[PDB]
Design a protein around this ligand. Structure first.
Ligand SMILES: [Cl-]
Ligand SMILES: [Cl-]
Ligand SMILES: [Cl-]
Ligand SMILES: [Cl-]
Ligand SMILES: [Mg+2]
Ligand SMILES: [Mg+2]
Ligand SMILES: [Mg+2]
Ligand SMILES: [Mg+2]
Ligand SMILES: [Mg+2]
Ligand SMILES: [Mg+2]
Ligand SMILES: [Zn+2]
Ligand SMILES: [Zn+2]
Ligand SMILES: [Zn+2]
Ligand SMILES: [Zn+2]
Lengths: 440, 439, 440, 439
């Protein structure tokens, strides 16, 4: 699936609808990024610029101008077509094709932006600008405004009001359209397939990075070339390290491996975690911790729906975790008192859920303690985990165990839709999947 | 293959040997790099910092202090061990383990660098610093020097002399040690295996990015997790675009595909290009252009040795190219006159060779027009190509053809060693490789 | 005369009245300014900061907070009292005395501004800030806003709207109160006395800078320690150079000297120009040019009143100049055609009038071509001039003559009040003044 | 007195003599400085730029190029001649007149500096630059060096070595030539005349700023248009505030007034302090403190010579101060023990002497605690003072008294010459001067 020309147009108009008359919104592309010396990382467009354009070049600026409540138009600054520069550094859209391709009224060369931007802003009352997002963008905007302020003899005037559009745009991004949900649906599926493959390929004696290799190959073959974030493959005690991305250890018989990986498909993030035994067989101790995390996930999946919140669902998970840990002798005391003193926190130190979209930790207001009431169209993760340090003062058999299970969901009218349930998570289904693969 | 602890030590001492007495050299780690919002790209250490340390963390600074011709020592600034911060953002070496691990005399917390660096530079005559390399580094160094200049009442003095160490260090990097050649040999082998795999897997109807996928999987399984540069898979008319990395087209029966891909193994770059038919069989027209490029490569491989230059070998390649293009009717006229007017340029617009090492386009002085005399230990690519535009005024059968063949070599006492010859390039061998895989 | 505590309070309230509810205005002091190495120029407060405070220290910030249409309050950031630092670098108001002295509700140490400003801006909808005025101020404001934007987990929010207050404040400054007019009245008088003295002291053989010395001594003895701008004493051919401040030549018998000088009194600028013969006696040629400039001034003084404009009065002056120059053979042709082609411009290349106040070239919107309609309370200069280059192609006797005559006026209900008429400008009165002094 | 063309030339050559071959020194003019909105303060040239040029324009850069031990030349960047811009903003030297006027081999437009500077630095080994002095200068220099570093394909190379010339130049400035001593002699005389005038004009009921007015008028009439620093006129309890420049109080019968004021003449600073009674007659209490300060000055004037130091002479002054304060009951105890515990510090908190020249607090290395051995040609102030706070726990009659007496001297082969002794400092002579003026 993909985003249509008409959708990009609808988004631009939804922003313009919220703008004051006599205003302009400026949305800048991401700069290119050095990896080492003259080599650059694969280009990643700014999510907000992408959201309004689907255009994957640097040195571009979308300018939306609202004259009044009926009249508005768009100007794109982008790199010019150059025979030599493209033979070398790849094809460029240019100014002639841009209006039709990207649905903008006017396209100008980015090399002319300082000569042109101030003319577009002259006489307007408001400029919408994400100040501080990029230094190169702030320089450009500040120069334009300075030319206008100081140009009274040339009959120039600067808009006195500057408004950050990020709160408005991020509120838009928080609610997914049907097109976006279909894309995320595909991202979840591609990501699930990768996690299934990793489970099937896994053997003791491989390195953690081998499973990363399988995962990335799977992303790529469905047309999702890049991960949405750096892949985590934490086996044994590496599973207790939340942002373990070294993936440098040999996977040992008797250890669990925690895999957190997600593709980026048409700009949108998948985000799945699965934890499973390297040898295809949960031990009793591993199973005992796993069940607590699974129950937490399964219960959260039942509960998530409009009218509740991440805070509220989290409270239920905490109860499950504390009860489970008390039954295993990992915690000692009264469940309610332990809950009151957040006794689970040494073992579950992160949030249960984050928004998901064009960024893996997506934009949008959470409310205090993530108390915002959920509504249809919100997309989020559900990712309970339990991490028992190698030196934790608990029954010895639980030490050095890190387990997280994470799905991606969209809130619907009546509940939620799980976008990542096509990869197994019940322990017996994990074992059966692995057995079958090892036959073959 | 790997770089030993002793090697890193040798390199540090080789720099210190070239430093003035009463001086300090400051070598800064690369910053972390945003991909989107709060997510970052996989960390890539600064090549120069890596060269002296093999240490893969940001927010670190290596300080080499030379008191005099016999006395020198090292101070590392790096991130402190933090229980919480590491549970989250991965393990850190810290200050206790660093001396032994990285062979430095002293390790200090990076958070203390502004409180400590000026004290280390106080009273020295010279500071070696790569000014302009990173803005965060310049801020730190300038603050230290300012404190010193303005601190006369506190008996502080700033070194008046600042020297850019990059010329010295890059001249070091230009000559590979045996350990480095062994690592580059492994990178060449890993890279060659990936290119072989791509040729064997290729079928019409796959997309260009599928071959990129095969290639990266191969890099990964030998322990080279990242490419050294963005992979090019340009099929058909995409072959004529030199930095084509979109790799977004369906590969079609009848087209050639040009693959330029290289792994990064222990920091060192492989860099191979192979061009081959998507359907496993060169057409006559494809073969006619391919042979010119292959002769150019094979001749260059015979010629490269100490005492010649990239400029000199390039002159031979140009003659091969012009002669071949005249035979095919792509160029018209007298070969020498065509050569004199660089008539090949529309078809071969880039250099024949670049240095290779910790960066794919490696550091080191080339000389004017790459005329520097070659010596043993230099590592470079050999990559002739011909690129005929879709709308070129030439016979139709040559339009939209892009062919490059690239190997990595090391200059030896008497010649060169080819590090990437384990992937085939003779057209008959390419065809046979593909036929065998398709059985 | 001076500005009262109550006036500074009225000004702050007039700004607050124009502010949106749930907003804060930030007004920063001027930085100290290096003259050479560790020595600094005499401190000059930012005119806008001065306007709301009458406070002459650097490292201070006035913060006006409007909660709603009835509730507002003020916070001052200023330097703390320090025993040692003051023994050295002079007395400081400090935090204890500031509320009563400057009429602010709260005073905080400037050293704490980064720890405190964001707390003041937290949860507001609008911040008023003169972006680009000072780099140190922009750093402070941008840091505060960045802390708020990124502080959602700490329940912080940044105002999304930033408004430049300069247009509003400069519009306030354009209309002088009675207190301000009384101060400007005194500045005009002090400045007039200085120009009278210069005429009386002038002898051939003195250097231009000697008259500058007399002028500055006169400013100082009335308590106006500093000029409002760099003093011009251009004798002979130096008179044709508009911003001649070298004042390095010996004044010659037979030359004119053009003196443009003004005091700064309680922050307000005087701005007078007088031109006169070094030897106390206008020649015929000098008199012929002088009369044209004088008629221009005298006519402009009759005309200035509410309902006209600088543009309109300028048109009358141009006619006077062109007619006069044609009569002398400096211009040749039809007066109306010469006027149509702006034939006067080689000889009068600057504006007739600028606003005057806390800055010599004062703030306030002029309108296109200075066409804004004049209203009571506006204060401006009237300064026709004629400058004939040494190499100008005109009758030889006029070459190298530079004459300007400048008064300061305030627009009243019925006309204007000339604040600087106490120094003579009629040629015979200049001559008589000089004769009397030479007896011385 | 004035600095000749030949002197400026000598200074440039003295710098070039100390430069390495294959180097360039870059000396930047001061920027213009805003007073309020579009109005600027009177321009003050950078002292170092002035030292080598005597040129009083902004947007100028002196470039001294040393090819080798015999060959060197100079390039000036300065503002172009512009008919319109000068009619408005005053005359400019321009490019045609500059070679002859300023004795430079070549003059270029400042507008072309970014297009030209890199070409001048290309291929040199060393660039001398005062990094951090001005932001606009650093931008220019860094841009040039960047162009050079990145311009290898255009056969450009950057000098790898950057040296701060300030230590060398400031060491030059520390030793005055005969021409400079003659100019400083004139500045001392002009300044002394102004202080004499202030004493003669002073009456109770005038404000402190009226004496500032007299002083500046005097500076001006001898052709010293600007003070070298902001004038201090601290009467009564304002005398105890070291950098009192408000000068806003009415001067009262019974009080002392402390006047610290100095002219700037041809760039060089006078720096005189005199303290005297507003009513022309010292009280006993005033005289008792005054005598201690005067003895301190007079003794210092006898002692200063080559071979001693500011530290050494200061030690004698401290003994004089402590002894005197003990006699008056301001300090209590054993003189040596009081000296050992620096018991004078509450009353004399600043240094006895600072270097003097193109800056009032002039450049040059002092040594630790100002222990550097004095040599002929050094110019410095001698300024003992005693400042007793209004709330000091001492006998009442000494509270709120601030007295400083300051002269400017030059060290000679055998001693010193006092450049400011033409204004009186003995209390009887001050009184007689004031009595005579009041007749
Ligand atoms: Cl462009
Ligand atoms: Cl740290
Ligand atoms: Cl403070
Ligand atoms: Cl210029
Ligand atoms: Mg995840
Ligand atoms: Mg390659
Ligand atoms: Mg074809
Ligand atoms: Mg004027
Ligand atoms: Mg002094
Ligand atoms: Mg007393
Ligand atoms: Zn997640
Ligand atoms: Zn290559
Ligand atoms: Zn004026
Ligand atoms: Zn002094």
């Amino acid at each position: 699936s993909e985003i249509s020309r008409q959708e990009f147009q609808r988004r631009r108009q939804a922003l313009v609808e919220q703008m004051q008359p006599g205003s302009a919104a400026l949305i800048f592309a991401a700069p290119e990024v050095t990896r080492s010396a003259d080599s650059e990382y694969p280009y990643r467009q700014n999510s907000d610029f992408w959201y309004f354009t689907g255009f994957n070049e640097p040195e571009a600026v979308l300018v939306l101008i609202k004259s009044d409540d009926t009249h508005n138009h768009s100007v794109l600054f982008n790199r010019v077509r150059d025979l030599t520069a493209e033979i070398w550094f790849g094809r460029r859209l240019g100014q002639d094709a841009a209006p039709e391709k990207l649905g903008v009224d006017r396209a100008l060369a980015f090399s002319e932006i300082n000569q042109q931007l101030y003319q577009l802003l002259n006489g307007l009352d408001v400029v919408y600008h994400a100040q501080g997002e990029y230094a190169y963008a702030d320089v450009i905007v500040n120069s334009a405004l300075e030319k206008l302020r100081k140009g009274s003899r040339q009959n120039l005037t600067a808009p006195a009001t500057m408004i950050d559009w990020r709160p408005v745009v991020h509120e838009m991004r928080l609610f997914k359209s049907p097109e976006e949900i279909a894309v995320l649906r595909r991202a979840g599926e591609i990501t699930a397939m990768a996690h299934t493959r990793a489970m099937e390929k896994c053997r003791p004696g491989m390195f953690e990075y081998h499973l990363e290799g399988e995962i990335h190959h799977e992303f790529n073959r469905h047309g999702a070339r890049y991960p949405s974030y750096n892949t985590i493959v934490g086996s044994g005690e590496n599973g207790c390290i939340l942002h373990y991305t070294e993936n440098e250890c040999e996977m040992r018989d008797g250890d669990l491996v925690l895999i957190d990986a997600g593709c980026e498909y048409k700009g949108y993030a998948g985000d799945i975690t699965r934890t499973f035994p390297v040898n295809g067989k949960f031990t009793q101790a591993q199973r005992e911790i796993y069940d607590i995390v699974l129950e937490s996930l399964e219960t959260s999946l039942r509960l998530y729906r409009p009218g509740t919140s991440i805070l509220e669902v989290t409270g239920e998970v905490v109860r499950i975790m504390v009860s489970g840990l008390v039954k295993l002798g990992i915690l000692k005391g009264d469940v309610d008192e332990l809950i009151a003193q957040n006794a689970h926190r040494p073992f579950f130190m992160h949030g249960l859920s984050h928004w998901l979209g064009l960024d893996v930790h997506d934009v949008g207001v959470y409310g205090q303690d993530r108390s915002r009431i959920l509504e249809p169209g919100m997309v989020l993760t559900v990712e309970p985990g339990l991490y028992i340090a190698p030196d934790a003062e608990v029954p010895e058999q639980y030490r050095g165990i890190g387990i997280r299970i994470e799905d991606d969901i969209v809130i619907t009218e009546t509940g939620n839709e799980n976008l990542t349930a096509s990869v197994v998570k019940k322990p017996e289904e994990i074992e059966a999947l692995m057995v079958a693969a090892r036959k073959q």
